[PDB]
Design a protein around this motif. Structure first.
Motif, mmCIF file in Angstrom:
data_model
loop_
_atom_site.group_PDB
_atom_site.id
_atom_site.type_symbol
_atom_site.label_atom_id
_atom_site.label_comp_id
_atom_site.label_asym_id
_atom_site.label_seq_id
_atom_site.Cartn_x
_atom_site.Cartn_y
_atom_site.Cartn_z
ATOM 1 N N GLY A 86 -0.942 9.838 -16.958
ATOM 2 C CA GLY A 86 -1.198 11.119 -17.320
ATOM 3 C C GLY A 86 -0.960 12.034 -17.369
ATOM 4 N N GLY A 87 0.368 11.753 -16.727
ATOM 5 C CA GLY A 87 1.850 13.117 -17.511
ATOM 6 C C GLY A 87 2.232 13.840 -16.396
ATOM 7 N N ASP A 88 2.760 14.444 -16.708
ATOM 8 C CA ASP A 88 3.386 15.485 -15.287
ATOM 9 C C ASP A 88 2.871 14.669 -13.763
ATOM 10 N N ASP A 89 2.145 15.811 -14.046
ATOM 11 C CA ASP A 89 1.146 15.272 -12.612
ATOM 12 C C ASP A 89 1.172 13.965 -11.711
ATOM 13 N N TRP A 90 1.747 13.090 -12.233
ATOM 14 C CA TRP A 90 2.540 11.361 -11.828
ATOM 15 C C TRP A 90 3.685 12.269 -11.214
ATOM 16 N N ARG A 91 4.512 12.940 -11.678
ATOM 17 C CA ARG A 91 5.958 13.125 -10.827
ATOM 18 C C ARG A 91 5.236 13.524 -9.596
ATOM 19 N N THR A 92 4.101 14.216 -9.648
ATOM 20 C CA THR A 92 3.770 14.787 -7.971
ATOM 21 C C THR A 92 3.110 13.827 -7.692
ATOM 22 N N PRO A 117 0.419 -1.529 0.145
ATOM 23 C CA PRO A 117 -0.304 -0.031 0.413
ATOM 24 C C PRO A 117 0.792 1.263 -0.041
ATOM 25 N N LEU A 118 1.822 0.986 0.144
ATOM 26 C CA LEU A 118 2.916 2.676 0.468
ATOM 27 C C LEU A 118 2.961 3.544 -0.791
ATOM 28 N N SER A 119 2.920 4.782 -1.116
ATOM 29 C CA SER A 119 3.013 5.632 -2.328
ATOM 30 C C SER A 119 3.992 6.162 -2.677
ATOM 31 N N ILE A 120 4.009 5.467 -3.937
ATOM 32 C CA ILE A 120 6.008 6.183 -4.730
ATOM 33 C C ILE A 120 5.780 7.270 -5.115
ATOM 34 N N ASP A 121 6.457 7.762 -4.858
ATOM 35 C CA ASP A 121 6.210 9.914 -5.508
ATOM 36 C C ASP A 121 7.142 9.435 -6.757
ATOM 37 N N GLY A 122 6.071 9.836 -8.219
ATOM 38 C CA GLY A 122 6.374 9.469 -9.400
ATOM 39 C C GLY A 122 7.876 10.528 -9.664
ATOM 40 N N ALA A 123 8.186 11.473 -9.119
ATOM 41 C CA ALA A 123 9.746 12.529 -9.011
ATOM 42 C C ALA A 123 10.795 11.525 -8.939
ATOM 43 N N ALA A 124 9.899 10.935 -7.549
ATOM 44 C CA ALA A 124 11.210 10.041 -6.537
ATOM 45 C C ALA A 124 11.990 8.429 -7.770
ATOM 46 N N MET A 159 -1.832 2.953 -9.443
ATOM 47 C CA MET A 159 -2.818 3.973 -8.695
ATOM 48 C C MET A 159 -2.737 4.755 -8.084
ATOM 49 N N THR A 160 -2.441 5.899 -8.392
ATOM 50 C CA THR A 160 -2.556 7.728 -7.361
ATOM 51 C C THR A 160 -3.187 6.765 -6.429
ATOM 52 N N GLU A 161 -3.477 7.267 -5.453
ATOM 53 C CA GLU A 161 -4.268 8.056 -3.690
ATOM 54 C C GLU A 161 -5.819 8.225 -5.123
ATOM 55 N N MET A 163 15.266 -6.218 -15.469
ATOM 56 C CA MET A 163 14.473 -5.001 -15.619
ATOM 57 C C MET A 163 14.377 -3.785 -15.662
ATOM 58 N N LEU A 164 14.454 -3.036 -16.518
ATOM 59 C CA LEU A 164 13.785 -2.004 -16.441
ATOM 60 C C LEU A 164 12.337 -1.133 -16.436
ATOM 61 N N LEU A 165 11.818 -0.706 -16.101
ATOM 62 C CA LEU A 165 10.740 -0.001 -16.146
ATOM 63 C C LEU A 165 10.434 1.269 -16.575
ATOM 64 N N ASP A 166 10.976 2.411 -16.998
ATOM 65 C CA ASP A 166 10.977 3.759 -16.451
ATOM 66 C C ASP A 166 9.880 4.572 -16.139
ATOM 67 N N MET A 167 9.961 4.790 -14.783
ATOM 68 C CA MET A 167 9.020 5.861 -14.499
ATOM 69 C C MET A 167 8.422 7.154 -15.203
ATOM 70 N N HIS A 168 9.043 7.299 -15.442
ATOM 71 C CA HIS A 168 10.120 9.330 -15.760
ATOM 72 C C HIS A 168 8.259 8.466 -17.741
ATOM 73 N N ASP A 169 9.284 7.384 -18.428
ATOM 74 C CA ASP A 169 7.779 6.770 -19.638
ATOM 75 C C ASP A 169 6.707 6.460 -18.537
ATOM 76 N N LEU A 170 6.848 5.854 -17.527
ATOM 77 C CA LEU A 170 5.455 5.475 -17.280
ATOM 78 C C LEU A 170 4.929 6.844 -16.365
ATOM 79 N N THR A 171 4.346 7.639 -17.480
ATOM 80 C CA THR A 171 3.066 9.177 -16.878
ATOM 81 C C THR A 171 1.764 8.713 -16.634
#
Length: 145
Positions: free
Chosen positions: A112-118, A44-51, A74-76, A102-110
């Protein structure tokens, strides 16, 4: 940056697999994909997109399948339903199960956008469209940066 990883020595806590048989080998997840596209739930722990710049999965597929499917992040706010799902193409991960960084890029995995980073993703369903009873070995799930 973010380097959070889950060792699989202690079973598959948090990273359980729904609709699948998650046989556990100490130090790895010998998950068997009974469904065509089983989803692996995440802690359940949340993961920051930017980090996290990428997901440094240690996963390698011992069996030969066609790994794919739209992983559910799923973001909250997003919720497991809907949200952003990325259908990752087969990256030619070893079908022999040889160790793969294996690398799945989170930056690639937006999500819905830059909002994901936040956005921080509380739960992840790892869709694994592949084959009936496809076997993958997952040593750990490191984050990136």
């Amino acid at each position: 940056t973010y380097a959070d990883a889950y060792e699989f020595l202690n079973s598959s806590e948090g990273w359980f697999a729904q609709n699948a048989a998650r046989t556990h080998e100490p130090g790895s997840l010998l998950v068997s994909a009974t469904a065509r596209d089983p989803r692996l739930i995440s802690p359940p722990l949340s993961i920051d997109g930017a980090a996290a710049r990428w997901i440094e999965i240690e996963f390698d597929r011992t069996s030969a399948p066609v790994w794919e499917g739209n992983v559910y992040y799923m973001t909250e706010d997003h919720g497991f339903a809907g949200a952003f799902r990325k259908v990752i193409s087969d990256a030619e991960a070893p079908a022999d199960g040889t160790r793969a960084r294996m690398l799945l890029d989170m930056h690639d995995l937006t999500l819905g956008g830059d909002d994901w980073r936040t956005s921080t993703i509380t739960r992840l369903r790892f869709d694994f469209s592949s084959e009936s009873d496809a076997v993958f070995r997952i040593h750990a799930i490191r984050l990136g940066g």
